[PDB]
Structure 1
């Protein structure tokens, strides 16, 4: 099964990770834009970009 969802990132909540490569993204689900999640992105990204996810409810904590 492929329950991927597209979420448009609206805010970059700074950067985290051991070496400092992964970024906080506040994504907003393209379906039902009422909902917002924070997640962790490898690679550069700006506001307005969209992301593809398999897991949807996983709101992972800060990597450390």
Structure 2
């Protein structure tokens, strides 16, 4: 229902008003899984830092770089 992702690095505040942050996350899955060690770029609402965890609940979309 939801997959936990660990924020690898923050790519910068996105858009006007700077309320959205572009981050790079690593999917936290068991070894040998199809999602293991795979990485996506995501948009995050709220204060986020490196080594922060998010429940993505959808890992197919990738945010447009900005």
Q: TM-score band, normalised by the shorter chain?
A: 0.7 to 0.9
How many residues align? The count is 60
Q: CA RMSD in A?
A: 1.4
**Cα deviation, residue 18, structure 1:** 2.4
Counterpart in the other structure of 1:25: 23
- The aligned counterpart of 1:35 is 38
TM-score (norm 2): 0.81
2:8 is the alignment partner of 1:10: yes
Q: Give 1 or 2: higher helix fraction.
A: 2
Where do 5+ consecutive residues of structure 1 fail to align? none
Equivalent residue number for residue 61 of structure 1 = 64
Structure 1 residue runs of 4 or more that deviate by more than 4 Å after TM superposition: none
Aligned-pair distance for 1:60? 2.1
